[PDB]
Amino acid sequence: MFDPAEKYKMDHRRRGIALIFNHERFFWHLTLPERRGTCADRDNLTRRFSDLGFEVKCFNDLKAEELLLKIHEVSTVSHADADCFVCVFLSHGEGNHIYAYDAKIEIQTLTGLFKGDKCHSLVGKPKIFIIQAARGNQTNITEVDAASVYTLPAGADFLMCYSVAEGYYSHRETVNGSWYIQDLCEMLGKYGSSLEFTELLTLVNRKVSQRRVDFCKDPSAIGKKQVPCFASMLTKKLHFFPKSN
Amino acid sequence: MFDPAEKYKMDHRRRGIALIFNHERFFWHLTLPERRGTCADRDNLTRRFSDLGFEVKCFNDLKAEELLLKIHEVSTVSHADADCFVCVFLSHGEGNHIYAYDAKIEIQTLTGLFKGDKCHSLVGKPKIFIIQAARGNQTNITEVDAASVYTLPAGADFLMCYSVAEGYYSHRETVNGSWYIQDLCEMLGKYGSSLEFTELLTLVNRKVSQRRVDFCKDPSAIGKKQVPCFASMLTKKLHFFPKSNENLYFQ
Ligand SMILES: Oc1cc(F)ccc1CNc1ncccc1-c1ncc[nH]1
């Protein structure tokens, strides 16, 4: 009795945790620009994910050691009573690395912690990573970075979500925050509870691609489009229906 | 006017083309194994895509020059009257390369041909690439390769579909063909016309992950799972509803 309309079970006592690593400054000797606007993203996400029933936990400007500890901590805690896990990175990145305050971190190792091997509590449950990261270029101005981070998948039941794809460009308003996050959170607010999540992520792909970049106050920032992607290795439909309590 | 249930328009006169590049042998001096079973995949796809209304066009064992020509040809023809475009690679691959008969080809350049810049006829229409490619290892046995090809996205309105993800392994029965393709085509046959395509691709992710690899006739082929992925850069729902062909020209 193989079922095509089959959903992940989102009926556990609690929804689960949403981690937000939020990097705005970096160690001088990396020569990486302030991400002015990232707090907008952090707060906006914190709201939308709280409203979907996540225990949200933000961490501003962790060093590597500090970060790996917090995320290892979370992997080893029991998620037995939780629907799913979410993790979000607002930073800079190159290839398969995210930037902590002090140095870069292999994404593989962070996702590697929730691989069913290493985190039994989350085997068979969706593990969403959302990554607003790009190459730091050097009232409310729009700053624009080149795509830099590889749009890798992880393992089974992981959904990797990316602000921008290879070739394209990533925009952040210094007050309103990243385009990706603005539009993501708009969709979460409107449709989070009703829509299948990938269906929604596709709405975000539309919303962001459709942002016009022809008439721009910077001459050199003209014709730099943004197209986000996502790499689903999910095996079922994913809905965030209101939990009864 | 913004609509969350918004679909790609699949009401053009014809559905479109499905290209299938199908590599079974390779130039001696590459030292790459025969992909015995790939014809199973080719025929199975050819059927399922024909049934969805695609003009299917297969190409067995093209050299690089031959391949680039056939695919450039197709990019420059007008797709104005077509719903979408599909392209499929049954070969070996490393990183961002597919293997033609004679040498490797940067995938970026093949997808690059349908980028709205370069192919106006397909701007705003879905461009699906399906890639059954992996590292050649060295009646019906199951052969098993390590994932090798990067699970890259392309541009806007591209859906990149991959037999296997980094770290995992890719299986092909020498008579029944690739696990990915068997399960893909099973789902296409059952659900192709009704279901949203990515919804279906997720069914394939389930079907393939769920294949057991504990009790195996090769000792060393035990505990090598297969998990395929897909990278959607699509912007709307994608359905392959039956086209209304009741006394009308579909050629
Ligand atoms: O997505 C990108 C973004 C970029 F800025 C530059 C290149 C890409 C595409 N490459 C990949 N895409 C998916 C999985 C792995 C890779 C990868 N690993 C090693 C080299 N490529």
Numbering used by the authors:
A (entry chain B): 30 to 167, 187 to 293
B (entry chain A): 30 to 167, 187 to 299
What did the study's authors say about this model?
Here we studied 30 congeneric ligands that each present a distinct heteroarene for stacking between tyrosine residues at the dimer interface of procaspase-6.
To confirm that binding poses and stacking interactions were conserved across analogs 1–30, we solved procaspase-6 complex crystal structures for 10 representative analogs spanning 3 orders of magnitude in measured KD value. Importantly, all 10 structures revealed binding poses almost exactly analogous to that adopted by 1, with the probe heterocycles positioned in apparently productive stacking interactions with tyrosine 198A and 198B. 9 vs 15), imidazole (cf. 8 vs 18), and triazole (cf. 22 vs 24). Recently, Bootsma et al. noted the importance in heteroarene stacking of the relative positioning of ring heteroatoms in otherwise similar heterocycles. We evaluated these predictions across the four relevant comparator sets, confining the analysis to analogs bearing an ortho N atom capable of IMHB formation. In the case of rings with dissimilar heteroatoms, we observe distal positioning to be favored, as predicted (cf.
